[PDB]
Amino acid sequence: AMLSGKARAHTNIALIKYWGKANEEYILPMNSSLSLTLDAFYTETTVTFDAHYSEDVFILNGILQNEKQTKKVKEFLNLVRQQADCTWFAKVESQNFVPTAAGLASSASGLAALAGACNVALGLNLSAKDLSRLARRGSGSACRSIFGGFAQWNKGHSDETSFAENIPANNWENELAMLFILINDGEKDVSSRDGMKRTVETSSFYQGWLDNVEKDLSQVHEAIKTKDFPRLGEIIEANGLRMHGTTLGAVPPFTYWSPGSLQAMALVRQARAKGIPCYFTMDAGPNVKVLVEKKNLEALKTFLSEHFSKEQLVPAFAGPGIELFET
Amino acid sequence: AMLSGKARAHTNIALIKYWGKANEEYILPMNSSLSLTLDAFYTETTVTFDAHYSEDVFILNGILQNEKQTKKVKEFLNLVRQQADCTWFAKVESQNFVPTAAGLASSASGLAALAGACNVALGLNLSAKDLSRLARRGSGSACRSIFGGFAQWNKGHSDETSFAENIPANNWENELAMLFILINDGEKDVSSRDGMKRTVETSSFYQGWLDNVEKDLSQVHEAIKTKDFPRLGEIIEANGLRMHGTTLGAVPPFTYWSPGSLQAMALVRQARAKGIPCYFTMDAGPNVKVLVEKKNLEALKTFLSEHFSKEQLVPAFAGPGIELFET
Ligand SMILES: Nc1ncnc2c1ncn2[C@@H]1O[C@H](COP(=O)(O)OP(=O)(O)O)[C@@H](O)[C@H]1O
Ligand SMILES: Nc1ncnc2c1ncn2[C@@H]1O[C@H](COP(=O)(O)OP(=O)(O)O)[C@@H](O)[C@H]1O
Ligand SMILES: C[C@@](O)(CCOP(=O)(O)OP(=O)(O)O)CC(=O)O
Ligand SMILES: C[C@@](O)(CCOP(=O)(O)OP(=O)(O)O)CC(=O)O
Ligand SMILES: [Co+2]
Ligand SMILES: [Co+2]
Ligand SMILES: [Co+2]
Ligand SMILES: [Co+2]
């Protein structure tokens, strides 16, 4: 009386940010978002549901996770057990090939992989659309890691209509790269979930964010259709700066940036000034991601090595959607 | 046929920021502001109007200023010459005891001192209120350096009704201190005037700024009446963060912060956590000012010496209003 399943999902980095939930229970977002799934960082997860288990167990990077660290996995397991009428405790064994809780989207790859493993184990036979909807319930960004390359999370207006899909770009995504500047791989002070809730509920800047996100998304789409790299980069750099601006208007205000974040951002502007087209974005933490055409990646890593070590510059290319495995 | 005059004015640091002009020609602000005039940084300026001069001359720190560097002094001289019907060129000799164009309010002390020197030389016999109105025409923050201690610039609605005045605080200002952390005394990339104009005209966050400034000012006034230091510090720290947030929503966005700015801000929060009540604010540049009660100033300088040199921690106390000199 045992059901098991496995999946691999890659991280994604948001080009147009998701920031703030319209519905906290179902993770319905205030705005639509768009990301690039990457090849460098991924999560591998197996789940086992077994009548003989006596409690839910979460093992991450070979390390048993404590009650606080398991609370959310347990929330996702409860949700999927209701969606199957399954009453069995589960064992979740996951390995993050990506720093955890550091602004490098380990919740995207991690909850996507768990959703996929659960889909397999409980024989749910979900379409990609419906697997995206389930992953959304664990972490918003995870619903986009179901797909490769460019993916859009349509905010919709209900559990049924909020989900992601691939954005065809006539192969453009394979002509691009993202260079991670690792300022700090440690666990971050304010979680993505808590930070965006504080922003929604208290930031005087949040309406400004909302009033600009759809225009940014439209221009990202026009840029894709024309493979206009400077236009893409200007939109996404400003979109990320606008998102981080919102936390300075929260009550109390806060920032995800660290000193090295600003150093890296300024350096990206120097690189542009000195003839390397590239644009930075930051998800919810201090690390800096630099969008750059593949042909300029080595140029950029060398430029940036003047201030960061080899261990701090990690390149990445477009990556695949989720991979399921019956075991 | 020569008229001469001299004045000394001290810098001020805004606790509630002025950010954005409702009228660029007359420097009427979008919101009222409140500052503390300080004893550590000041400007000394002499002006001479003489029928024999052949052009306006501006000498700053013993160095002749070029055309670009004199444009604004020339605008202030033209204005004051119209207000006297004087047709004579002038020589302005000024010494800044304060880094220039670095976010340490050298335009406040400098244009205040020039306004005072011109008042003297042309025998204008201005009340403090009217001298504040004239200094306002050279630099907004300068209209507050006419007064000592706490001073408020009332935005008014016309050249006649926009001016500053002292805020009585039952001696509280003499129980306080401000510690400057000098991250970079160099000349800054984006001027205060250009930065705030870009913000007014393009920032999606500017309305949020406007919608909160009057509430901040009110609470600063209640805190003064009760000498409530924690309440003052929380208001002013959030007000400064909100002001800097507005530039991340500008088009194109920008920041005045440098890496050391964030380091210093984080350290101030550590100091609070480890039992030293103190609060940071930043004017338009990378340097960080820390409001602190006098009794905790040495504690704080020692705490901060773990990461900054002696040459980077400059203390300051409340300072006087403008001093005029007939020569
Ligand atoms: N492999 C995983 N399986 C389950 N939950 C995970 C996994 N990796 C990360 N998480 C969850 O994601 C949280 C971090 O979420 P978030 O604050 O969005 O950070 P990040 O920048 O890593 O995406 C972790 O503390 C944990 O709750
Ligand atoms: N002593 C002075 N006399 C005249 N103008 C001055 C003086 N000191 C500074 N200024 C003007 O102020 C400008 C800096 O203004 P601002 O951008 O507000 O910088 P700050 O942070 O120093 O106040 C200088 O470039 C110059 O135009
Ligand atoms: C700024 C972002 O990186 C925030 C991602 O937040 P999460 O997707 O981690 O949050 P939850 O829905 O609470 O799990 C932008 C993005 O990934 O779209
Ligand atoms: C953020 C501030 O430091 C900006 C001061 O700007 P200025 O008074 O230098 O600007 P102008 O009116 O253009 O001369 C806040 C303040 O001093 O009130
Ligand atoms: Co996340
Ligand atoms: Co993200
Ligand atoms: Co100034
Ligand atoms: Co100022």
Q: Does B167 share its domain with B187?
A: no
Query: CB distance A241–B251 less than 8 Å?
Result: no
Q: Whose CA is nearest to atom 2 of ligand 1?
A: A110
Q: Please give the full DSSP string across A202-223, using - where no structure is assigned.
A: H-TTHHHHHHHHHHHHHHHHHH
Domain that holds residue A172: 1-181
Binding residues of B for ADP: 94, 96, 101, 103, 105-107, 188, 192
A153 φ, ψ (degrees, to nearest 5): -95, 110
Q: Does B162 share its domain with B195?
A: no
Instruction: Single out the residue in B181, B207, B242 at which a domain terminates.
Output: B181
CA of B288 relative to ligand 4 center, distance in Å: 15
Cα distances from B19 to residues A214, B33, B213, in angstroms, run 28, 9, 10
Q: Which two tokens stand for residue A224?
A: 């894709």
B183-194 burial, b at 16+ Cβ within 10 Å, e below that, comes to bbbeebebebbe
Which residues lie closer than 8 Å to B179 by C-beta, 6 or more apart?
Answer: B278, B289, B290, B292, B297, B300, B301, B304, B313, B314, B315, B316
Helix (H/G/I), strand (E/B), else coil: A181: strand
**Region class of B101: left (phi > 0), else alpha (psi between -120 and 50), else beta:** left
Q: CA B46, B51, B54, B56 torsion: positive or negative? A: positive
Which residues lie closer than 8 Å to B226 by C-beta, 6 or more apart?
Answer: none
Q: Tell me how far apart the alpha carbons of residues A226 and A220 are, in angstroms, rounded to a whole number.
A: 10
Q: Which two tokens stand for residue A219?
A: 């221009």
CA of B188 relative to ligand 7 center, distance in Å: 11
The residue assigned the tokens 């002749």 is: B64
Closest to A209 measured CA to CA, from B214, B208, B197, B243 = B208
Residue type, B24: E
Q: Which two tokens stand for residue A121?
A: 């184990």
Query: CB distance A262–B248 less than 8 Å?
Result: no
Q: Tell me how far apart the alpha carbons of residues A144 and A166 are, in angstroms, rounded to a whole number.
A: 8
CATH of the domain at B119: 3.30.230.10
Resolution of this model in Å is 2.3
- State the SS3 of B204-265: CCHHHHHHHHHHHHHHHHHHHHCCCHHHHHHHHHHHHHHHHHHHCCCCCCCCCCCHHHHHHH
The minimal CB distance from A238 to the residues B246, B253, B262 is found for B253
Residue type, A35: S
Binding residues of B: 94, 96, 101, 103, 105-107, 188, 192
Q: Which atom of ligand 3 is nearest to the CA of A13?
A: 17
CATH of the domain at A276: 3.30.70.890
Query: CB distance B248–A241 less than 8 Å?
Result: yes
Q: Which two tokens stand for residue B1?
A: 């046929």
Closest to B194 measured CA to CA, from B250, B133, B238, B110 = B250
Residue type, A66: N
The distance of A13 to chain B (nearest Cα, Å) reads 20
Q: Tell me how far apart the alpha carbons of residues A92 and A73 are, in angstroms, rounded to a whole number.
A: 8
Q: Which two tokens stand for residue A113?
A: 């992989």
A18-49 burial, b at 16+ Cβ within 10 Å, e below that, comes to bbbbeeeeebbbbbbbbbbbbbbbbbbbbbbb
Question: What burial class does residue A80 get, using C-beta atoms within 10 Å of its C-beta: 0-12 exposed, 13-18 middle, 19+ buried?
Answer: buried
Q: Are B209 and B242 in contact (CB under 8 A)?
A: yes
Q: Are A316 and A178 in contact (CB under 8 A)?
A: yes
Q: Tell me how far apart the alpha carbons of residues A233 and A126 are, in angstroms, rounded to a whole number.
A: 35
Q: Are A10 and A144 in contact (CB under 8 A)?
A: no
Closest to A41 measured CA to CA, from A92, A107, A114, A93 = A107
Q: Tell me how far apart the alpha carbons of residues A37 and A145 are, in angstroms, rounded to a whole number.
A: 6
Which residues lie closer than 8 Å to A235 by C-beta, 6 or more apart?
Answer: A16, A216, A219, A220, A223
B23 φ, ψ (degrees, to nearest 5): -135, 115
Instruction: Single out the residue in B165, B181, B197 at which a domain terminates.
Output: B181
Q: Tell me how far apart the alpha carbons of residues A157 and B264 are, in angstroms, rounded to a whole number.
A: 43
DSSP letter assigned to residue B318 = B
Helix (H/G/I), strand (E/B), else coil: B10: strand
Pairing of strands B90-97, B33-50: antiparallel
Q: Tell me how far apart the alpha carbons of residues B147 and B141 are, in angstroms, rounded to a whole number.
A: 11
**Region class of B235: left (phi > 0), else alpha (psi between -120 and 50), else beta:** alpha
The residue assigned the tokens 């347990």 is: A74
Helix (H/G/I), strand (E/B), else coil: A163: strand
**Region class of B311: left (phi > 0), else alpha (psi between -120 and 50), else beta:** alpha
Query: CB distance B207–A208 less than 8 Å?
Result: yes
Question: Vertex A270, ends A268 and A273: CA angle to 5°?
Answer: 115
Instruction: Single out the residue in A166, A181, A196 at which a domain terminates.
Output: A181
Please name every residue paired with B95 in a beta bridge, in sequence order, or none if there are none: B44
Q: Does A164 share its domain with A262?
A: no
Which residues lie closer than 8 Å to A273 by C-beta, 6 or more apart?
Answer: none
Which chain B residues are Cβ-neighbours of A258 within 8 angstroms?
A: 262, 266
CA of A113 relative to ligand 1 center, distance in Å: 12
Q: Tell me how far apart the alpha carbons of residues B316 and B179 are, in angstroms, rounded to a whole number.
A: 6
Q: Does B223 share its domain with B320?
A: yes
Q: Does A259 share its domain with A306?
A: yes
Q: Which two tokens stand for residue A24?
A: 């906290």
Q: CA A257, A262, A268, A269 torsion: positive or negative? A: positive
Q: Where are the beta strands (DSSP E) in chain B?
A: 2-16, 21-23, 28-29, 33-50, 57-60, 63-64, 90-97, 150-154, 163-166, 176-181, 278-281, 288-293, 313-316, 323-325
Q: Tell me how far apart the alpha carbons of residues B131 and B86 are, in angstroms, rounded to a whole number.
A: 18
Q: Which two tokens stand for residue A72?
A: 């959310």
Query: CB distance A263–B259 less than 8 Å?
Result: yes
Q: Tell me how far apart the alpha carbons of residues B41 and B38 are, in angstroms, rounded to a whole number.
A: 7
Question: Vertex B59, ends B285 and B80: CA angle to 5°?
Answer: 85
Pairing of strands B313-316, A63-64: unpaired
Question: What burial class does residue B16 get, using C-beta atoms within 10 Å of its C-beta: 0-12 exposed, 13-18 middle, 19+ buried?
Answer: buried
Q: Does B218 share its domain with B91?
A: no
Q: Tell me how far apart the alpha carbons of residues A44 and A117 are, in angstroms, rounded to a whole number.
A: 9
Q: How many residues does chain B have?
A: 327
The minimal CB distance from A249 to the residues B245, B257, B261 is found for B245
CA B142 to chain centre: 6
Which residues lie closer than 8 Å to A210 by C-beta, 6 or more apart?
Answer: A30, A31
Q: Which two tokens stand for residue A168?
A: 């065809």
Which chain B residues are Cβ-neighbours of A211 within 8 angstroms?
A: 204
Which chain B residues are Cβ-neighbours of A207 within 8 angstroms?
A: 207-208
Q: In this structure, how many other beta carbons lie within 10 angstroms of the beta carbon of residue A129? A: 13
Question: Vertex A212, ends A12 and B21: CA angle to 5°?
Answer: 130
Q: Whose CA is nearest to atom 3 of ligand 2?
A: B110
Q: Does B149 share its domain with B191?
A: no
Asked whether A72 lines ligand 1 (CB < 6 A), one says yes
Q: Tell me how far apart the alpha carbons of residues B281 and B261 are, in angstroms, rounded to a whole number.
A: 10
Q: Are A19 and A249 in contact (CB under 8 A)?
A: no
User: Of B205, B210, B246, which to mutate for an interface test with A (greatest number of A Cβ within 10 Å)?
Assistant: B205
CA of A87 relative to ligand 3 center, distance in Å: 30
Closest to B20 measured CA to CA, from B110, B153, B179, B132 = B153
Closest to A244 measured CA to CA, from B205, B188, B290 = B205
If one counts the domains in chain B, the total is: 2
Q: Does A141 share its domain with A230?
A: no
Asked whether A246 lines ligand 3 (CB < 6 A), one says no
Q: Tell me how far apart the alpha carbons of residues B45 and B93 are, in angstroms, rounded to a whole number.
A: 6
Asked whether B199 lines ligand 4 (CB < 6 A), one says no
Q: Does B41 share its domain with B143?
A: yes
User: Of B198, B202, B203, B204, which to mutate for an interface test with A (greatest number of A Cβ within 10 Å)?
Assistant: B204
A38 φ, ψ (degrees, to nearest 5): -115, 155
Q: Does B149 share its domain with B259?
A: no
Q: Does A272 share its domain with A166?
A: no
Q: Tell me how far apart the alpha carbons of residues B65 and B76 are, in angstroms, rounded to a whole number.
A: 15
Q: Does B300 share its domain with B229?
A: yes
Asked whether B90 lines ligand 4 (CB < 6 A), one says no
Q: Whose CA is nearest to atom 24 of ligand 2?
A: B101
Asked whether A33 lines ligand 3 (CB < 6 A), one says yes
Query: CB distance A208–B251 less than 8 Å?
Result: no
The minimal CB distance from B248 to the residues A242, A259, A266 is found for A242
